[PDB]
Amino acid sequence: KNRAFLKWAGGKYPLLDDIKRHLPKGECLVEPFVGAGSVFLNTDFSRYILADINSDLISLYNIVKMRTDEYVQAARELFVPETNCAEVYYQFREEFNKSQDPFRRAVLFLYLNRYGYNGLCRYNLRGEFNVPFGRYKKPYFPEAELYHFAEKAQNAFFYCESYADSMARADDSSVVYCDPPYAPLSFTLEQQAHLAEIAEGLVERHIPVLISNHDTMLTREWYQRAKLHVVKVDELLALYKPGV
DNA sequence: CTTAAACTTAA
DNA sequence: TTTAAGTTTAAG
């Protein structure tokens, strides 16, 4: 199992086997909520359409893909012991927030993700990264995961857009997997239900859609028109399967 | 996770 | 003619 080079909340890494077990085959996989892209890195589709609302994330992904060797060499220089203190961290965080250069921001983004607290990605309403120092002993530099990502990204397109726009890209040969922000144990409840509506529209166009979420009475109401599978609170896999 | 600041509401 | 109580936001 291949790991993502980013630390991300709800990476769905221990759930990969279950997801892949209920994920239909197709020419193209569409991910409206790509995140770290664990499913992307552990599946074998001919091409991928990967989207997310986070512009820094999508920007980073395209840079790692197109300027791989340049990026790895630049980002590696920040994974040294000298940068592992709070004072240096908050200066790099400041440099990130003031920079208008996509490459430099992408380089610092990896640093902030590995040196920041719990790999959190948090912004204020100004759009400024404000995750505090993580105080780690020895942050790992994901050089292998970076190169593996770039290799797989050769057949992937990245888009910075909401789920409704990315799911509209799906066609007859597509499969859609959705990993939205977790429902109550930002992404509103109305958006949670609207996601299910779009999936119902797609499944009538003979486009298979798989949704992962918490197993609650509220999520079961949303995904009531789908085949429900309980994993291991519990994890819910809502599969929308077209009837040929 | 926590506290503090920013901002609104009521009466 | 006011300000404590609430709600949201910022950030260690």
Ligand SMILES: C[S@@+](CC[C@H](N)C(=O)[O-])C[C@H]1O[C@@H](n2cnc3c(N)ncnc32)[C@H](O)[C@@H]1O
């Ligand atoms: C990794 S997925 C959810 C993972 C896991 N279920 C959890 O909640 O911890 C979260 C991602 O969805 C993206 N996202 C949030 N709202 C979105 C939206 N409206 N449209 C597309 N992507 C969105 C965020 O950028 C974030 O990276």
